[PDB]
Amino acid sequence: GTSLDLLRSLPRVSLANLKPSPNSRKRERRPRDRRRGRKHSFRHQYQPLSLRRLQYLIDLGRVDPTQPIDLTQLVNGRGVTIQPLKRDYGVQLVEEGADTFQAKINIEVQLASELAIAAIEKNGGVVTTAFYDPRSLEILCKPIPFFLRGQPIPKRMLPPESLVPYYTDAKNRGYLADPAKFPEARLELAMKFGYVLPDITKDELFRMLSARKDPRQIFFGLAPGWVVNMADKKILKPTDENLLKYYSS
Template identity: 35%
Template sequence: MVPNLAMWSSLRILRAGAAVARPAWSSIPRISLANYATVSTVRIGNLAPAQPKKQRKRLGRGDGSDRGGTSTRGNKGQKGRAGNGKPKPGFEGGQMPLIRLIPKRGFVNSHKQTFAPVNLDRLQFWIDQGRIDPSQPITVKELYESRCIHQIHDGVKLLGDGSKHLTTPIHIVVSRASQSAIKAVEATGGSIVCRYYNALSLRAQVKPHKWLLRNKPLPHFADPVSKRDLLWYSSPNNRGYLALRDAQRRAADKADSA
């Protein structure tokens, strides 16, 4: 069907009327999308991190990304696979590692203990300077706080070097003591007790404020578990605290029975 002139004229009249009769919402001013972010203050679309964020490498996204295909791992091989791409240090592809080819000499004693040494002449010098009060029992805490020792390690051992300079009677509690140090201390009228400390009890002895600030009780002193330490601290010749405890218990039992 071919449209005639009457139909064309009616279409023109309808279009002209539609242009004249505009709806009410068309009078609202429109804001372009380019100016939308500038007009609004804070929106999700214009949020950005305070510092520039480093973009991570997106591997395996096609050849056009320059990181597709083998994902920058090269062609085949052990390091091009997933899983065991990074073997542990010392692995040399299956051959005998160099660390196993080198001959070994000696061994490392896992039960070795390192004690901070304290000589009697140094202890007397600290007493003469007023850094240590001899009227009170001298423990690891007083030795460490007065800087008579700088590191505690596994405890403190009293040595008899400079015993002729010791003139003040002292009452000291340490981890170990030599026989010459024991004789020199007792010759001046003092006493010595060898006490076993583990790592936790040493830390509580030196820095008790860490428990007090948290309103927690101080940990109890631990007793030795190895046979060597039990025999050493049970010997009265070593002035061990276990031997002193047994002597006090026997004396108490004897007083009760009497």
């Protein structure tokens, strides 16, 4: 660093010596003299994740491959930005990276492409779709604040009748999907590509990959209606029978 050596040779700097960078500040005109003298909401605003964008996160180790993909974890890693003021209502995927993302992992995304669904399943990944209420999703993205507010964990909402067919559809692999068709559906997709179907049971970590929360359950770890002792780093569970009726309701 020859620049540093020049500083030693140069005289000690003072407050007055400081000077603004060249061209940083423009000149101004003032009237001192003659110079200035004389004279749509209903449609969900899906926020997608590109397959190429998905690929680098796994390759860079930003998201642990062993841990199932969680949208909250992506927010924790600053992978995606969700603004409640924007009233983002959904999540999607982008066709970009279809040719550059060869990997298998369990994941849940609100909306997924049918071609993408089978391709990751062909690789061995597990993909499903869940419905998060836009207000609930904002709560999900920021779980700590409502604990600060003191609010208790509410039951996850269900899709409106317009979106019920999508989630209930077996091919869409939604949480409302019929399990009976899943073994047949998995078989059908394998034939379409022709790849040899790997049964989810064969995987050693099958239970971890296939683990899913209840439709009313917002969080994998936390059941609906739960409370968290944030100050004491503990979880509080309601013990009132009437409260169970509220959760059932």
